[PDB]
């Protein structure tokens, strides 16, 4: 070998970009999202009726880590449902959401470079 490990190109492509999305240049905008959002921290009592499947940068990090993603449309899938998350719990007017706009174009421009 040869350099790589056995995952297909397009795993190391995800994992790349889930990569560069804890970049620190991306930091100032991506940090709401490294982690499960903190409930109890937060005071958002409402968040797990309004919210059916909570998703983060660190639960997407240890799916590509247990090889859980068998494709990148999986791996695609979680990344969104984080987003859609932020859409639908917080204000539109929101400083996070605006946060996460920000934050799904450096993901969107970067997965729609997936190799096929």
Same mark, same amino acid.
């Given at each position: 070998? *040869?350099? =790589?490990?056995?995952?297909?190109?397009?795993?190391?492509?995800?994992?790349?970009?889930?990569k560069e999305m804890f970049a620190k240049k991306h930091a100032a905008y991506?940090?709401?999202?490294?982690?499960?959002?903190?409930?109890? *921290?937060? =005071?958002?009592?409402?968040?797990?009726?309004?919210i059916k499947h909570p998703m983060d940068m660190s639960t997407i990090k240890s799916k590509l880590e247990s090889r859980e993603y068998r494709d990148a449309q999986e791996f695609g899938a979680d990344v969104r449902?984080?987003?859609?998350n932020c859409y639908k719990y917080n204000p539109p007017d929101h400083e996070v959401v605006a946060m996460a706009r920000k934050l799904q174009d450096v993901?969107?421009?970067?997965?729609?470079?997936?190799p096929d």
């Amino acid at each position: 070998g *040869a350099m =790589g490990s056995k995952i297909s190109e397009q795993l190391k492509c995800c994992s790349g970009i889930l990569k560069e999305m804890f970049a620190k240049k991306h930091a100032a905008y991506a940090w709401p999202f490294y982690k499960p959002v903190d409930v109890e *921290a937060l =005071g958002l009592h409402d968040y797990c009726d309004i919210i059916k499947h909570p998703m983060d940068m660190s639960t997407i990090k240890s799916k590509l880590e247990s090889r859980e993603y068998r494709d990148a449309q999986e791996f695609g899938a979680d990344v969104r449902l984080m987003f859609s998350n932020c859409y639908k719990y917080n204000p539109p007017d929101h400083e996070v959401v605006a946060m996460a706009r920000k934050l799904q174009d450096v993901f969107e421009m970067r997965f729609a470079k997936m190799p096929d």
